[PDB]
Ligand binder design. Structure first.
Ligand SMILES: O=c1c(Cc2ccccc2)c(O)nc2sc3cc(Cl)ccc3n12
Length: 448
């Protein structure tokens, strides 16, 4: 249902000719939901979530579409044929280059008007299968003809081609992003190249296996800052009544969470204590563009506040250019020996929309956070929150994970930004929201 390189007119004709009523598609415009008369519904994503006009806020475009197909009718997704966003698709490439690149089950489809399925087999050889394209459909020389190269690949992923002498041409996996640290050259090549690689990652949203059940419960709706933006049930924080919109991220561990609500302040301190977290990363202001993003869950400097069964002291506040650092002290009301310092690094210079022009400041912040975390024996996950706990939270954890690798291996390590994002998304959907953030992660790793 997502079409990466179409226009409003192309979409309008597609839905009128190849579609019916209830038929819909999505496309980059910022996104547009084109439904069939043909209506165009705007989707904006400045970095926190997908905000549909006259609709709701979502972690992914696929979560958005799944919700409106279940609850202007979204009934029939009008499928896209362009293979540009598929991992296996290389477009322009020769046989030799594909042979050398592939040098088991590893495949690709390359490019008169015809395509070539190059597959590796071993314990080795590279088999090239021609794909004829006649009157818009695709085929391997006989049998079934496919509406798109996608239908072809998925048909042969399930049903592999058998070579004359019994060789199974398995379609297992498509890696063109695992660059060695060195980054400078890759950033130049992706400079767009970044948007192309970003939407390939977006096309991998629905491959992820996750449930959102506990967050959809009656007793837990009030505990969600955005009703549709929910934690993954397999990695959610269970409080030992048990609910918080938070997930554990394990590549140093992190807890990705939303900005505190007035009714979730006590549950946030119950989580920090239980998890033995000593570092909080706040990547948002309490209020941005007149809307509240997170409530003040920490006392004023020198003050002491009781938050349910938890007691928090604000020892000292230390201002830096980009951030404030609050030395907090947490204990359970009743038992004195339960006390520990909790350090809250509150980044305040993040723009209301988009990303910082330079990642220097973010990189100084994360460096400080990392050394404060490494200075504490038996320390729990680093708590990271923004507004929804997916956009900024995701950009901060991904940059932190990748620089963690470059700290322990040096300028000689193999990094894969989209592979890291997909892995984090497997633990909380929507982690890293926009293409601008995606590019900022590359620029951050570059500047580091
Ligand atoms: O998806 C994966 C998986 C599989 C995977 C599944 C769950 C959690 C982590 C990893 C994998 O090993 N490697 C890569 S590289 C790559 C590039 C892009 Cl643009 C998009 C995806 C993608 N991708």
């Amino acid at each position: 249902w997502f079409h990466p390189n179409i226009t409003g007119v192309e979409a309008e004709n597609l839905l009128l000719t190849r579609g019916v009523d209830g038929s819909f598609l999505a496309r980059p415009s910022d996104f547009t939901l084109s439904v069939r008369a043909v209506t165009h519904i705007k989707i904006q994503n400045t970095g926190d979530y997908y905000d549909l006009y006259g609709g709701e806020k979502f972690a992914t475009l696929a979560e958005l579409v799944q919700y409106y197909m279940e609850h202007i009718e979204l009934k029939y997704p009008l499928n896209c044929a362009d293979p540009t966003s598929e991992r296996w698709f290389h477009g322009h490439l020769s046989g030799k280059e594909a042979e050398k690149l592939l040098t088991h089950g590893s495949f690709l489809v390359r490019e008169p008007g015809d395509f070539v399925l190059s597959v590796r087999t071993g314990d080795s050889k590279v088999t090239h299968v021609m794909i004829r394209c006649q009157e818009l459909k695709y085929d391997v020389g006989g049998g079934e003809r496919f509406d798109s190269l996608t239908d072809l690949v998925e048909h042969y992923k399930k049903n592999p081609m058998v070579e004359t002498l019994g060789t199974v041409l398995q379609l297992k996996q498509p890696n063109t992003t695992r660059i060695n640290a060195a980054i400078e050259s890759r950033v130049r090549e992706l400079s767009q190249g970044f948007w192309e690689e970003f939407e390939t990652l977006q096309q991998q949203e629905c491959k992820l296996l996750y449930s959102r059940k506990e967050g959809q419960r009656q007793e837990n709706k009030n505990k969600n800052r955005y009703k549709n933006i929910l934690p993954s049930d397999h990695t959610r924080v269970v409080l030992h009544s048990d609910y918080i919109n938070a997930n554990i991220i394990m590549p140093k561990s992190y807890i990705a969470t939303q900005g505190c609500l007035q009714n979730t302040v006590n549950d946030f301190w119950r989580m920090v204590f239980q998890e033995n977290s000593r570092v909080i990363v706040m990547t948002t202001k309490e209020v941005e563009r007149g809307k509240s993003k997170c409530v003040k869950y920490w006392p004023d400097e020198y003050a002491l506040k009781e938050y349910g069964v938890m007691r928090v002291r604000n020892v000292k506040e230390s201002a830096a250019h980009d951030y404030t650092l609050r030395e907090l002290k947490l204990s359970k009301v009743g038992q004195g020996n339960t006390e520990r310092t909790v350090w809250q690094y509150h980044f305040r210079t993040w723009p209301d929309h988009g990303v910082p022009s330079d990642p220097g400041g973010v990189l100084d912040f994360l460096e400080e956070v990392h050394h404060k975390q490494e200075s504490i024996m038996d320390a729990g996950p680093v708590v990271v929150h923004c507004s929804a706990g997916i956009g900024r939270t995701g950009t901060f954890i991904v940059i932190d994970i990748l620089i963690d690798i470059i700290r322990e291996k040096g300028v000689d390590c193999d990094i894969d930004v989209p592979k890291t994002i997909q892995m984090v998304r497997s633990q909380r959907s929507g982690m890293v929201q926009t293409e601008a953030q995606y590019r900022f992660i590359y620029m951050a790793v570059q500047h580091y």
